[PDB]
């Protein structure tokens, strides 16, 4: 399962999806973007590079704990932004990729 989790990350990082996945590669840079309310709204920030480091450090007991951090990442985007924001559309497109792969394991 955890080997299947590494492949899920490889797909989400792949060039085919980079046009909408790139905001989720790294932690939201609140200081550079002026998002000084982000920490008040988002209790648990999460991104793909942090997920990758947690995976390699064996911080996930199983694929469901891995999947929870991926979905936390999307849920943070859906919570913080207005629904018509372009970043929300990008999160949904990347969630499409993740959910189709996660379903196959
Ligand atoms: O949910 C997000 C929201 C935003 C964002 C940026 C500038 C604004 O003026 C704004 O209203 C929202 O930026 C992000 C980002 O840069 C990421 O890498 C990942 C997620 C987000």
Short mmCIF file of N, CA, C and O and ligand atoms in Angstrom, two decimals:
data_model
loop_
_atom_site.label_atom_id
_atom_site.label_comp_id
_atom_site.label_asym_id
_atom_site.label_seq_id
_atom_site.Cartn_x
_atom_site.Cartn_y
_atom_site.Cartn_z
N UNK A 1 0.82 -1.21 0.00
CA UNK A 1 0.00 0.00 0.00
C UNK A 1 0.86 1.26 0.00
O UNK A 1 0.61 2.19 -0.77
N UNK A 2 1.87 1.29 0.88
CA UNK A 2 2.73 2.46 0.98
C UNK A 2 3.60 2.62 -0.26
O UNK A 2 3.98 3.74 -0.62
N UNK A 3 3.92 1.51 -0.93
CA UNK A 3 4.54 1.61 -2.25
C UNK A 3 3.56 2.17 -3.28
O UNK A 3 3.95 2.93 -4.17
N UNK A 4 2.28 1.80 -3.17
CA UNK A 4 1.28 2.41 -4.04
C UNK A 4 1.13 3.89 -3.73
O UNK A 4 0.80 4.68 -4.63
N UNK A 5 1.40 4.29 -2.49
CA UNK A 5 1.34 5.71 -2.13
C UNK A 5 2.45 6.50 -2.79
O UNK A 5 2.24 7.64 -3.21
N UNK A 6 3.65 5.91 -2.89
CA UNK A 6 4.74 6.58 -3.59
C UNK A 6 4.39 6.82 -5.06
O UNK A 6 4.70 7.87 -5.62
N UNK A 7 3.74 5.84 -5.70
CA UNK A 7 3.34 6.02 -7.09
C UNK A 7 2.26 7.06 -7.27
O UNK A 7 2.24 7.77 -8.28
N UNK A 8 1.37 7.20 -6.29
CA UNK A 8 0.36 8.26 -6.35
C UNK A 8 1.03 9.62 -6.35
O UNK A 8 0.65 10.52 -7.11
N UNK A 9 2.05 9.80 -5.50
CA UNK A 9 2.76 11.07 -5.47
C UNK A 9 3.50 11.32 -6.78
O UNK A 9 3.52 12.45 -7.28
N UNK A 10 4.11 10.27 -7.35
CA UNK A 10 4.80 10.43 -8.63
C UNK A 10 3.84 10.93 -9.70
O UNK A 10 4.22 11.75 -10.55
N UNK A 11 2.60 10.43 -9.70
CA UNK A 11 1.65 10.90 -10.70
C UNK A 11 1.27 12.35 -10.44
O UNK A 11 1.24 13.17 -11.36
N UNK A 12 1.01 12.70 -9.17
CA UNK A 12 0.59 14.07 -8.87
C UNK A 12 1.70 15.08 -9.14
O UNK A 12 1.40 16.24 -9.45
N UNK A 13 2.96 14.66 -9.07
CA UNK A 13 4.10 15.52 -9.40
C UNK A 13 4.45 15.52 -10.88
O UNK A 13 5.33 16.30 -11.28
N UNK A 14 3.80 14.70 -11.71
CA UNK A 14 4.25 14.51 -13.08
C UNK A 14 3.91 15.71 -13.96
O UNK A 14 2.98 16.48 -13.70
N UNK A 15 4.67 15.84 -15.06
CA UNK A 15 4.54 16.99 -15.95
C UNK A 15 3.14 17.13 -16.54
O UNK A 15 2.68 18.25 -16.78
N UNK A 16 2.45 16.01 -16.79
CA UNK A 16 1.12 16.04 -17.39
C UNK A 16 0.14 16.89 -16.57
O UNK A 16 -0.75 17.53 -17.13
N UNK A 17 0.31 16.92 -15.25
CA UNK A 17 -0.59 17.63 -14.36
C UNK A 17 -0.03 18.95 -13.83
O UNK A 17 -0.70 19.62 -13.05
N UNK A 18 1.18 19.35 -14.25
CA UNK A 18 1.84 20.48 -13.60
C UNK A 18 1.10 21.80 -13.79
O UNK A 18 1.31 22.72 -12.99
N UNK A 19 0.25 21.91 -14.81
CA UNK A 19 -0.44 23.17 -15.08
C UNK A 19 -1.47 23.50 -14.01
O UNK A 19 -1.81 24.67 -13.82
N UNK A 20 -1.99 22.49 -13.31
CA UNK A 20 -2.87 22.73 -12.18
C UNK A 20 -2.35 22.20 -10.86
O UNK A 20 -2.88 22.56 -9.81
N UNK A 21 -1.31 21.36 -10.86
CA UNK A 21 -0.82 20.84 -9.59
C UNK A 21 0.17 21.76 -8.90
O UNK A 21 0.37 21.62 -7.68
N UNK A 22 0.79 22.70 -9.63
CA UNK A 22 1.93 23.42 -9.07
C UNK A 22 1.65 24.18 -7.78
O UNK A 22 2.57 24.27 -6.95
N UNK A 23 0.45 24.73 -7.52
CA UNK A 23 0.25 25.39 -6.22
C UNK A 23 0.40 24.45 -5.05
O UNK A 23 0.63 24.92 -3.93
N UNK A 24 0.26 23.15 -5.26
CA UNK A 24 0.23 22.20 -4.16
C UNK A 24 1.57 21.50 -3.97
O UNK A 24 1.69 20.67 -3.06
N UNK A 25 2.58 21.88 -4.74
CA UNK A 25 3.90 21.27 -4.61
C UNK A 25 4.53 21.57 -3.26
O UNK A 25 5.17 20.69 -2.66
N UNK A 26 4.40 22.80 -2.78
CA UNK A 26 5.11 23.32 -1.62
C UNK A 26 4.12 23.98 -0.66
O UNK A 26 3.00 24.32 -1.05
N UNK A 27 4.51 24.17 0.60
CA UNK A 27 3.64 24.88 1.54
C UNK A 27 3.22 26.24 1.00
O UNK A 27 4.00 26.94 0.36
N UNK A 28 1.97 26.61 1.26
CA UNK A 28 1.48 27.94 0.95
C UNK A 28 2.40 28.96 1.60
O UNK A 28 2.63 28.92 2.81
N UNK A 29 2.96 29.88 0.80
CA UNK A 29 3.87 30.91 1.31
C UNK A 29 3.05 32.11 1.79
O UNK A 29 2.88 33.10 1.08
N UNK A 30 2.56 32.02 3.03
CA UNK A 30 1.62 33.02 3.53
C UNK A 30 2.26 34.40 3.56
O UNK A 30 1.62 35.40 3.20
N UNK A 31 3.53 34.48 3.96
CA UNK A 31 4.20 35.78 4.06
C UNK A 31 4.35 36.44 2.69
O UNK A 31 4.09 37.64 2.54
N UNK A 32 4.76 35.67 1.68
CA UNK A 32 4.99 36.26 0.36
C UNK A 32 3.70 36.63 -0.35
O UNK A 32 3.68 37.57 -1.15
N UNK A 33 2.61 35.91 -0.07
CA UNK A 33 1.33 36.15 -0.71
C UNK A 33 0.41 37.07 0.09
O UNK A 33 -0.68 37.40 -0.39
N UNK A 34 0.81 37.47 1.30
CA UNK A 34 -0.03 38.33 2.12
C UNK A 34 -1.26 37.67 2.69
O UNK A 34 -2.26 38.36 2.96
N UNK A 35 -1.22 36.35 2.90
CA UNK A 35 -2.38 35.60 3.41
C UNK A 35 -2.31 35.48 4.93
O UNK A 35 -2.22 34.39 5.50
N UNK A 36 -2.36 36.64 5.59
CA UNK A 36 -2.15 36.71 7.04
C UNK A 36 -3.34 36.20 7.84
O UNK A 36 -3.24 36.10 9.06
N UNK A 37 -4.45 35.84 7.18
CA UNK A 37 -5.57 35.17 7.82
C UNK A 37 -5.54 33.66 7.61
O UNK A 37 -6.39 32.96 8.17
N UNK A 38 -4.59 33.15 6.82
CA UNK A 38 -4.60 31.74 6.46
C UNK A 38 -4.51 30.83 7.68
O UNK A 38 -5.23 29.83 7.78
N UNK A 39 -3.63 31.17 8.63
CA UNK A 39 -3.44 30.33 9.81
C UNK A 39 -4.66 30.34 10.72
O UNK A 39 -4.89 29.38 11.47
N UNK A 40 -5.45 31.42 10.67
CA UNK A 40 -6.66 31.49 11.48
C UNK A 40 -7.74 30.55 10.95
O UNK A 40 -8.58 30.08 11.72
N UNK A 41 -7.74 30.30 9.64
CA UNK A 41 -8.79 29.52 8.98
C UNK A 41 -8.37 28.07 8.80
O UNK A 41 -9.18 27.16 8.96
N UNK A 42 -7.11 27.86 8.45
CA UNK A 42 -6.58 26.55 8.11
C UNK A 42 -5.77 26.08 9.32
O UNK A 42 -4.66 26.56 9.57
N UNK A 43 -6.34 25.16 10.10
CA UNK A 43 -5.67 24.72 11.32
C UNK A 43 -4.47 23.83 11.02
O UNK A 43 -3.52 23.80 11.81
N UNK A 44 -4.48 23.12 9.89
CA UNK A 44 -3.45 22.13 9.59
C UNK A 44 -3.03 22.25 8.13
O UNK A 44 -3.57 21.55 7.26
N UNK A 45 -2.07 23.12 7.82
CA UNK A 45 -1.61 23.25 6.43
C UNK A 45 -0.97 21.95 5.96
O UNK A 45 -0.37 21.21 6.75
N UNK A 46 -1.09 21.69 4.66
CA UNK A 46 -0.51 20.47 4.12
C UNK A 46 -0.24 20.68 2.64
O UNK A 46 -0.96 21.41 1.96
N UNK A 47 0.82 20.02 2.14
CA UNK A 47 1.20 20.14 0.74
C UNK A 47 1.89 18.84 0.31
O UNK A 47 2.22 18.00 1.14
N UNK A 48 2.15 18.73 -1.00
CA UNK A 48 2.69 17.48 -1.54
C UNK A 48 4.13 17.22 -1.11
O UNK A 48 4.52 16.06 -0.96
N UNK A 49 4.95 18.26 -0.94
CA UNK A 49 6.33 18.02 -0.51
C UNK A 49 6.38 17.57 0.94
O UNK A 49 7.22 16.74 1.31
N UNK A 50 5.50 18.13 1.78
CA UNK A 50 5.42 17.66 3.16
C UNK A 50 4.91 16.23 3.22
O UNK A 50 5.41 15.41 4.00
N UNK A 51 3.91 15.90 2.39
CA UNK A 51 3.40 14.53 2.33
C UNK A 51 4.50 13.59 1.89
O UNK A 51 4.65 12.49 2.44
N UNK A 52 5.30 14.00 0.90
CA UNK A 52 6.37 13.13 0.42
C UNK A 52 7.40 12.89 1.52
O UNK A 52 7.88 11.76 1.69
N UNK A 53 7.74 13.93 2.29
CA UNK A 53 8.70 13.75 3.38
C UNK A 53 8.14 12.87 4.48
O UNK A 53 8.87 12.06 5.07
N UNK A 54 6.85 13.02 4.80
CA UNK A 54 6.22 12.17 5.81
C UNK A 54 6.22 10.71 5.37
O UNK A 54 6.43 9.81 6.19
N UNK A 55 5.94 10.46 4.09
CA UNK A 55 5.96 9.11 3.54
C UNK A 55 7.33 8.48 3.70
O UNK A 55 7.48 7.35 4.19
N UNK A 56 8.37 9.21 3.29
CA UNK A 56 9.72 8.67 3.34
C UNK A 56 10.20 8.49 4.77
O UNK A 56 11.00 7.58 5.05
N UNK A 57 9.72 9.32 5.70
CA UNK A 57 10.03 9.16 7.11
C UNK A 57 9.10 8.17 7.82
O UNK A 57 9.14 8.08 9.05
N UNK A 58 8.28 7.44 7.05
CA UNK A 58 7.39 6.40 7.58
C UNK A 58 6.42 6.95 8.63
O UNK A 58 6.18 6.33 9.67
N UNK A 59 5.84 8.11 8.34
CA UNK A 59 4.87 8.70 9.25
C UNK A 59 3.44 8.26 8.97
O UNK A 59 2.53 8.62 9.73
N UNK A 60 3.21 7.48 7.91
CA UNK A 60 1.89 6.96 7.59
C UNK A 60 1.87 5.46 7.87
O UNK A 60 2.70 4.71 7.35
N UNK A 61 0.91 5.03 8.69
CA UNK A 61 0.81 3.61 9.01
C UNK A 61 0.25 2.81 7.85
O UNK A 61 0.54 1.62 7.71
N UNK A 62 -0.56 3.44 7.01
CA UNK A 62 -1.23 2.75 5.92
C UNK A 62 -1.66 3.79 4.90
O UNK A 62 -1.44 4.99 5.06
N UNK A 63 -2.28 3.30 3.82
CA UNK A 63 -2.66 4.19 2.73
C UNK A 63 -3.77 5.16 3.14
O UNK A 63 -3.87 6.26 2.57
N UNK A 64 -4.60 4.78 4.11
CA UNK A 64 -5.67 5.69 4.52
C UNK A 64 -5.12 6.90 5.25
O UNK A 64 -5.64 8.01 5.08
N UNK A 65 -4.06 6.73 6.05
CA UNK A 65 -3.45 7.89 6.69
C UNK A 65 -2.77 8.79 5.65
O UNK A 65 -2.82 10.02 5.76
N UNK A 66 -2.13 8.18 4.65
CA UNK A 66 -1.59 8.95 3.54
C UNK A 66 -2.71 9.70 2.81
O UNK A 66 -2.60 10.91 2.56
N UNK A 67 -3.80 9.00 2.48
CA UNK A 67 -4.88 9.63 1.75
C UNK A 67 -5.52 10.77 2.51
O UNK A 67 -5.96 11.75 1.91
N UNK A 68 -5.55 10.68 3.84
CA UNK A 68 -6.13 11.75 4.65
C UNK A 68 -5.33 13.04 4.51
O UNK A 68 -5.91 14.14 4.46
N UNK A 69 -4.00 12.94 4.44
CA UNK A 69 -3.19 14.15 4.27
C UNK A 69 -3.36 14.75 2.87
O UNK A 69 -3.40 15.98 2.71
N UNK A 70 -3.48 13.90 1.85
CA UNK A 70 -3.76 14.41 0.50
C UNK A 70 -5.09 15.16 0.49
O UNK A 70 -5.19 16.28 -0.01
N UNK A 71 -6.14 14.55 1.05
CA UNK A 71 -7.44 15.20 1.03
C UNK A 71 -7.49 16.42 1.95
O UNK A 71 -8.24 17.37 1.68
N UNK A 72 -6.73 16.40 3.05
CA UNK A 72 -6.57 17.60 3.87
C UNK A 72 -6.09 18.77 3.02
O UNK A 72 -6.60 19.89 3.12
N UNK A 73 -5.11 18.50 2.15
CA UNK A 73 -4.58 19.51 1.25
C UNK A 73 -5.69 20.13 0.39
O UNK A 73 -5.80 21.36 0.29
N UNK A 74 -6.53 19.29 -0.23
CA UNK A 74 -7.63 19.83 -1.04
C UNK A 74 -8.64 20.56 -0.17
O UNK A 74 -9.14 21.62 -0.57
N UNK A 75 -8.99 19.99 0.98
CA UNK A 75 -10.02 20.58 1.83
C UNK A 75 -9.59 21.96 2.32
O UNK A 75 -10.42 22.87 2.43
N UNK A 76 -8.29 22.15 2.59
CA UNK A 76 -7.79 23.47 2.97
C UNK A 76 -8.06 24.48 1.86
O UNK A 76 -8.48 25.62 2.13
N UNK A 77 -7.81 24.09 0.61
CA UNK A 77 -8.07 24.99 -0.52
C UNK A 77 -9.56 25.31 -0.63
O UNK A 77 -9.94 26.48 -0.85
N UNK A 78 -10.41 24.30 -0.50
CA UNK A 78 -11.85 24.54 -0.61
C UNK A 78 -12.37 25.37 0.55
O UNK A 78 -13.36 26.08 0.39
N UNK A 79 -11.73 25.27 1.71
CA UNK A 79 -12.20 26.03 2.85
C UNK A 79 -11.79 27.50 2.77
O UNK A 79 -12.59 28.39 3.10
N UNK A 80 -10.57 27.77 2.30
CA UNK A 80 -10.02 29.12 2.43
C UNK A 80 -10.56 30.07 1.37
O UNK A 80 -10.73 31.26 1.65
N UNK A 81 -10.84 29.57 0.18
CA UNK A 81 -11.10 30.41 -0.99
C UNK A 81 -12.57 30.47 -1.35
O UNK A 81 -13.34 29.55 -1.05
N UNK A 82 -12.99 31.53 -2.04
CA UNK A 82 -14.32 31.51 -2.63
C UNK A 82 -14.41 30.43 -3.68
O UNK A 82 -13.42 30.10 -4.36
N UNK A 83 -15.59 29.82 -3.86
CA UNK A 83 -15.70 28.65 -4.74
C UNK A 83 -15.35 28.92 -6.20
O UNK A 83 -15.00 27.98 -6.92
N UNK A 84 -15.44 30.16 -6.66
CA UNK A 84 -15.12 30.46 -8.05
C UNK A 84 -13.66 30.84 -8.26
O UNK A 84 -13.28 31.18 -9.38
N UNK A 85 -12.84 30.80 -7.21
CA UNK A 85 -11.43 31.10 -7.36
C UNK A 85 -10.76 30.07 -8.26
O UNK A 85 -11.04 28.87 -8.18
N UNK A 86 -9.85 30.55 -9.12
CA UNK A 86 -9.14 29.66 -10.03
C UNK A 86 -8.36 28.57 -9.28
O UNK A 86 -8.22 27.46 -9.79
N UNK A 87 -7.84 28.87 -8.09
CA UNK A 87 -7.06 27.86 -7.38
C UNK A 87 -7.95 26.70 -6.95
O UNK A 87 -7.50 25.55 -6.83
N UNK A 88 -9.24 26.96 -6.73
CA UNK A 88 -10.15 25.89 -6.34
C UNK A 88 -10.37 24.94 -7.50
O UNK A 88 -10.41 23.71 -7.32
N UNK A 89 -10.53 25.48 -8.71
CA UNK A 89 -10.62 24.64 -9.90
C UNK A 89 -9.38 23.79 -10.07
O UNK A 89 -9.46 22.62 -10.47
N UNK A 90 -8.21 24.35 -9.77
CA UNK A 90 -6.98 23.58 -9.91
C UNK A 90 -6.93 22.46 -8.89
O UNK A 90 -6.58 21.32 -9.22
N UNK A 91 -7.34 22.75 -7.65
CA UNK A 91 -7.39 21.70 -6.64
C UNK A 91 -8.32 20.57 -7.06
O UNK A 91 -7.98 19.39 -6.91
N UNK A 92 -9.50 20.91 -7.61
CA UNK A 92 -10.42 19.86 -8.05
C UNK A 92 -9.83 19.02 -9.18
O UNK A 92 -10.03 17.80 -9.22
N UNK A 93 -9.12 19.65 -10.12
CA UNK A 93 -8.50 18.88 -11.20
C UNK A 93 -7.45 17.91 -10.67
O UNK A 93 -7.36 16.77 -11.13
N UNK A 94 -6.65 18.35 -9.69
CA UNK A 94 -5.66 17.46 -9.09
C UNK A 94 -6.32 16.39 -8.23
O UNK A 94 -5.85 15.25 -8.19
N UNK A 95 -7.42 16.73 -7.55
CA UNK A 95 -8.14 15.72 -6.79
C UNK A 95 -8.72 14.65 -7.71
O UNK A 95 -8.81 13.48 -7.31
N UNK A 96 -9.12 15.03 -8.94
CA UNK A 96 -9.55 14.03 -9.92
C UNK A 96 -8.46 12.99 -10.14
O UNK A 96 -8.73 11.78 -10.15
N UNK A 97 -7.22 13.44 -10.33
CA UNK A 97 -6.11 12.53 -10.57
C UNK A 97 -5.90 11.63 -9.36
O UNK A 97 -5.74 10.40 -9.49
N UNK A 98 -5.86 12.23 -8.17
CA UNK A 98 -5.63 11.47 -6.95
C UNK A 98 -6.73 10.44 -6.72
O UNK A 98 -6.44 9.29 -6.38
N UNK A 99 -7.99 10.84 -6.85
CA UNK A 99 -9.06 9.91 -6.47
C UNK A 99 -9.12 8.73 -7.42
O UNK A 99 -9.39 7.60 -7.00
N UNK A 100 -8.87 8.97 -8.71
CA UNK A 100 -8.86 7.86 -9.66
C UNK A 100 -7.74 6.86 -9.35
O UNK A 100 -7.93 5.64 -9.49
N UNK A 101 -6.57 7.35 -8.93
CA UNK A 101 -5.47 6.45 -8.60
C UNK A 101 -5.67 5.76 -7.25
O UNK A 101 -5.39 4.56 -7.11
N UNK A 102 -6.14 6.52 -6.27
CA UNK A 102 -6.38 5.98 -4.93
C UNK A 102 -7.43 4.87 -4.98
O UNK A 102 -7.32 3.87 -4.26
N UNK A 103 -8.43 5.02 -5.85
CA UNK A 103 -9.47 4.01 -6.00
C UNK A 103 -8.93 2.67 -6.51
O UNK A 103 -9.55 1.63 -6.27
N UNK A 104 -7.80 2.67 -7.22
CA UNK A 104 -7.32 1.45 -7.87
C UNK A 104 -6.47 0.56 -6.97
O UNK A 104 -6.15 -0.57 -7.37
N UNK A 105 -6.11 1.00 -5.77
CA UNK A 105 -5.19 0.20 -4.97
C UNK A 105 -5.89 -0.95 -4.25
O UNK A 105 -7.12 -1.00 -4.16
O1 LIG B 1 -5.65 28.15 -1.42
C1 LIG B 1 -4.78 28.93 -1.86
C2 LIG B 1 -5.07 30.30 -1.96
C3 LIG B 1 -4.11 31.18 -2.46
C4 LIG B 1 -4.33 32.63 -2.60
C5 LIG B 1 -3.24 33.38 -3.05
C6 LIG B 1 -3.33 34.75 -3.22
C7 LIG B 1 -4.53 35.37 -2.95
O2 LIG B 1 -4.65 36.72 -3.10
C8 LIG B 1 -5.69 34.58 -2.48
O3 LIG B 1 -6.88 35.18 -2.21
C9 LIG B 1 -5.56 33.21 -2.32
O4 LIG B 1 -2.87 30.77 -2.84
C10 LIG B 1 -2.50 29.48 -2.77
C11 LIG B 1 -1.15 29.11 -3.21
O5 LIG B 1 -0.29 30.06 -3.67
C12 LIG B 1 -0.78 27.68 -3.13
O6 LIG B 1 0.47 27.33 -3.52
C13 LIG B 1 -1.71 26.75 -2.65
C14 LIG B 1 -3.01 27.11 -2.23
C15 LIG B 1 -3.43 28.45 -2.28
#
